[PDB]
Design a protein around this ligand. Structure first.
Ligand SMILES: CCCCCCCC/C=C\CCCCCCCC(=O)O[C@H](COC(=O)CCCCCCCCCCCCCCC)COP(=O)(O)OC[C@@H](O)CO
Ligand SMILES: CCCCCCCC/C=C\CCCCCCCC(=O)O[C@H](COC(=O)CCCCCCCCCCCCCCC)COP(=O)(O)OC[C@@H](O)CO
Ligand SMILES: CCCCCCCC/C=C\CCCCCCCC(=O)O[C@H](COC(=O)CCCCCCCCCCCCCCC)COP(=O)(O)OC[C@@H](O)CO
Ligand SMILES: CCCCCCCC/C=C\CCCCCCCC(=O)O[C@H](COC(=O)CCCCCCCCCCCCCCC)COP(=O)(O)OC[C@@H](O)CO
Ligand SMILES: [Ca+2]
Ligand SMILES: [Ca+2]
Ligand SMILES: [Ca+2]
Ligand SMILES: [Ca+2]
Lengths: 592, 592
């Protein structure tokens, strides 16, 4: 039970530079009082001083809310611009978002910049909302005692934690529900269809298309249901953006904050050497592991040891990749991005490329380098001094079951005093990052899309993992993280593109595997061509079918629209009246 | 010099059924007088009676215009809803469009239904606007004395003949200008690069992508420049639509006009037997022609006779296809379409399929059936009783130069008395159909995209033909057709899709030809794969590049937007003021 505290600011103050901090402390408090926020300073753990921030008067917040609504209508995410009409009430998500905007936005936008990165607030560590322990307990208990989740649970998640967390949980729920179809015909193929079935690959591609398009429709439906349809158009300035000078684009009077694009491109070009070095190092590691496993297969008991290195490889996956992820972040911090959307998209692209490598390159080597060309691992036995087509199937099994275990291990198993202690322990937790969960789900989807044909049972394992994850991530948000700042998005974002890629490549990969493990380059090229064009045709057909489904968003929009809803002139003086024209026409008929 | 006549209605009246017509004649005149239109009945040629219609009072037309503007703003094609602000004036195109709406729209929409097809007006033949002979003379003289046309000419065409004709002429101008690049490197390949150059095919695919994407951007720019951005969303009811009953969709109170979709699908399924019969008959005709030409090559003088049948084939193209076109129209009249957009799209799709067959199947047979499999025309010499890889090149030459000649032959070389005579001769002319010109240009673009690699000089011939056509179609509209009703479109329509198809297929066709005429299925499949994926990658790259060009529409839109622009409460009673919080914070700093 919180004490009405809306936000908490850390404001670490070390004794080495206390003086510069001390005056800065007052520079904080006044900077809040001018915005109409009541402040509450209290003791902090490890030479810190947490300050609690709440709304001073409800009238100021109502007006702020009204102002926000007006802007949202201006940018087009609202239907009609509405101050005593609150009886659309203010949910906790949007109230917290507006409080964060008041605390964060500069004086130009009616706020007061307390950004903990760019400005003089170098002693402010984190500004975070507090957790509702009763709500978290009820949420966990309700989700852990139900086999399925209706839209009511996702709506509650939206109301409490914002639209980003709600969109992630909706995507996870839809993906888990759609994983039932694939799981069914994967078990069917495993039971009856022998090994490396081509029709299973076709069904997997069809399911990938169907799920991707249906989710693209469902996210639009959800965005319309909430009030966040079109937020992607609203560009948000990044506080960390460093400028060179301020210009004035001759379209508006706004003094834009310019940065030479060529300077940014000169840094973005540093991604190519980084990606090449990462791919070379990981390729060397995977080649070494494959050579060692081939040597341990050739030279002798059980068959579990044959892929023992591969297991270890994935055990090293969350470390190695993690390190790489950090580098990616630094790279994304080196190229300046003036928009939150652009920065997020670039970071997501870099992380997706790195995780794609670290998660799929071993399978790619096993399927398209070792099996077709089984004469390059000669050097393999030569160095280790002291062709099985089921290799890809066993590698897929070990890349399905064991990474699930390692991710579960990483994520799950690893009169005022009580409230103050709770806040103090909350500040040490890490801020929730939904991009990591999105990346994990996208990686699993890619596994299903382009490698489940080797082991069709992978879909069932991923379905069980997704059911467990729908509650594991809820528990992680509830007790293992600070409450995320409630943001607003109309979609899962650039991850959508990733999904499409992982679908398309799947159509080329799966069928190729089917040709390369069931037994001439002509046949392989023909199979790849047929699979890719079948994928494209199915994509067109599914898009056409879903374009004629009459989604609630469209009828809601058209309902709103409906509710809103001399000789040159003597030519006409000859017969000016009414009856004379008819009479003359009748005479003209009689004559001819 | 017209006499201020806005529209002319034919109203044919035969002596066999004059009585039923005679009363119906009055049923016309009153039906116009209620809308506020001055009428003028005069003699007609061949037992007809033309009636001229003009605006009765300028106030009624101004109000009608105002009403139209309000609707356009409601559907979202206008920036802001504006009656004395006419000083955006009324151009001739929109004035004529509103007069046609008054004459055509039923009483529900403020008009009076004088549709010459569905209602009792079975004697009304055509309602057409009159031609401005002075404007036509000036237009032809200006266009025939200039090497290039600026946007001023296209704007004048928009102002006079509406947005459909203007969009066609803009597309033709852009296509002719973009045909310069291809023409240049086609002459380069023809001069130096031997025969069947692969890099020429890659350049042709790149140009197809570039032109298609740049035109997709340019049409959006033109739609924003005019007031027709988003008209595609405005669905227009088709007067010819036959109903079964009227329902009420539970989203609006409008009594929708229902028609069972399954009944329409049962008729749309008749397209498959029709298409199969057409393709079989045309395939038999082309196989017979190819066999006869092969026999006349084998048995003996000149080399012009070898492709003499092929020439004749294209001479039979505008007849045979024409007949098929008529059937297509009847088919499109058999499946009921409740929207003008849907009816137009279906008719365009049927016509495109038929013309695709009749224009490309001979080349497809010569390139992918005769050359690869040169042992199926055995029966060829056997029946005619009484492998050259340059066959495709010569066939492409004869399908370039000669169809241009046949289309030119088909299109070009084949105090009140004077005004009345001019109108009488105008009623006998055929209404201008821009879909035919769009189809011809799309067919030529397909020729360039997927068959110009056989004869690279085809681009220069098509460029000369396009320059001549920019004036030939203008002359056809000026003197060989009635003035089209000024419609409103935001794009060239479904033809866009056709272009994309004719681009994609080109990437598969061109390169295939390069492999099949320069010399193993593996090589052919590899070349097709590389060409198609190069096309897709180039498409993505060009889309990304053009998404960051800052088109005038976007800045105009964002400029318009900018211009529009107890213990639970004692926690805060401990330090309520301003100075006390700072003092206590300083003390807390001093203590720790
Ligand atoms: C080795 C495998 C590499 C796969 C390449 C990544 C393809 C998926 C890219 C995943 C991603 O989120 O990036 C999107 C665009 O991608 C890109 O700009 C592609 C950049 C080049 C990819 C390298 C975002 O853009 P958006 O439109 O969502 O905003
Ligand atoms: C390598 C670039 C990969 C770009 C990844 C971006 C992407 O989403 O590509 C999708 C599939 O790719 C493709 O169809 C073509 C990828 C060709 C790459 C082969 C080399 C198309 O997604 P859509 O356009 O629907 O958005
Ligand atoms: C033998 C060659 C056949 C080529 C197939 C035609 C492909 C181009 C189709 C040309 C066309 O205008 O049709 C579009 C959709 O096409 C279609 O519905 C495809 C229908 C099946 C094609 C048969 C219109 O739709 P839209 O989105 O513009 O409204
Ligand atoms: C046969 C169906 C042809 C559908 C024609 C409709 C079409 O425009 O297809 C274009 C190319 O086709 C394709 O990429 C795939 C066509 C595969 C057909 C091969 C069989 C894609 O155009 P987009 O999606 O950009 O709109
Ligand atoms: Ca997990
Ligand atoms: Ca997770
Ligand atoms: Ca012509
Ligand atoms: Ca023409």
């Amino acid at each position: 039970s919180n004490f009405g505290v809306d936000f908490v600011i850390h404001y670490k103050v070390p004794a080495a530079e206390r003086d510069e901090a001390e005056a800065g402390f007052v520079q904080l408090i006044r900077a809040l009082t001018t915005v109409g926020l009541a402040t509450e300073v209290r003791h902090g753990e490890n030479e810190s001083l947490l300050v609690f921030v709440k709304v001073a008067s409800p009238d100021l917040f109502a007006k702020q809310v009204y102002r926000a609504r007006l802007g949202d209508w201006l940018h087009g995410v609202r239907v009609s611009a509405p101050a005593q009409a609150l009886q659309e009430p203010v949910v906790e998500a949007e109230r917290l978002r507006l409080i964060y905007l008041m605390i964060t936005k500069p004086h130009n936008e009616g706020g007061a910049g307390v950004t903990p990165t760019n400005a003089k607030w170098k002693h402010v560590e984190s500004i975070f909302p507090l957790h509702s322990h009763s709500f978290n307990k009820e949420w966990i208990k309700k989700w852990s005692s139900k086999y399925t989740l209706e839209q009511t649970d996702i709506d509650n998640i939206r109301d409490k934690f914002g639209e980003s967390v709600a969109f992630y949980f909706a995507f996870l729920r839809s993906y888990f529900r759609f994983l039932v179809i694939p799981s069914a015909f994967g078990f069917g193929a495993w039971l009856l269809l022998g090994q490396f079935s081509y029709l299973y690959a076709l069904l997997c591609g069809l399911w990938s298309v169907v799920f991707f398009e249906y989710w693209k429709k469902q996210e639009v439906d959800l965005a319309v249901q909430w009030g966040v349809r079109g937020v992607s158009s609203i560009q948000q300035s990044r506080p960390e953006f460093e400028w060179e000078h301020e210009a004035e684009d001759p379209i508006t009077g706004e003094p834009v904050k310019v940065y030479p694009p060529m300077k940014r491109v000169k840094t973005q070009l540093l991604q190519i050497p980084f990606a090449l070095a990462c791919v070379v190092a990981l390729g060397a590691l995977i080649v070494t592991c494959n050579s060692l496993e081939v040597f341990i297969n050739e030279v002798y008991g059980k068959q579990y040891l044959g892929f023992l290195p591969t297991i270890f490889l994935v055990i090293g996956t969350p470390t190695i990749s993690g390190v790489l992820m950090g580098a990616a972040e630094k790279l994304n911090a080196m190229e300046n991005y003036a928009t939150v959307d652009a920065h997020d998209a670039a970071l997501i692209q870099k992380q997706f490329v790195l995780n794609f490598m670290t998660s799929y390159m071993a399978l790619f080597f096993t399927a398209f380098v070792y099996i077709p060309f089984g004469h390059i691992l000669h050097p393999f036995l030569n160095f280790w001094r002291a062709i099985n087509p089921a290799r890809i199937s066993n590698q897929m099994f070990y890349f399905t079951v064991t990474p699930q275990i390692v991710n579960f291990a990483t994520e799950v198993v690893v009169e005022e005093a009580e409230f103050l202690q709770r806040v103090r322990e909350e500040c040490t937790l890490e801020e929730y990052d939904v991009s990591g969960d999105y990346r994990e789900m996208v990686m699993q989807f890619g596994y299903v899309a382009m490698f489940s044909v080797a082991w069709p049972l992978a879909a069932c394992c991923f379905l069980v993992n997704n059911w467990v994850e729908l509650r594991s991530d809820a528990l992680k948000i509830a007790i293992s993280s600070r409450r995320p700042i409630p943001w607003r998005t109309d979609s899962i974002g650039p991850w959508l593109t990733a999904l499409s890629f992982l679908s398309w490549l799947g159509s080329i990969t799966s069928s190729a595997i089917v040709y390369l493990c069931s037994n001439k380059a002509w046949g392989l090229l023909l199979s790849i061509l047929f699979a890719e064009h079948f994928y494209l045709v199915v994509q067109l057909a599914v898009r056409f079918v879903l374009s004629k489904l009459d989604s609630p968003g469209l009828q809601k929009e058209r309902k709103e629209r409906f509710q809103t809803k001399t000789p040159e002139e003597m030519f006409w003086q000859r017969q000016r009246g009414m009856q004379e024209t008819i009479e003359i026409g009748r005479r003209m008929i009689e004559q001819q």
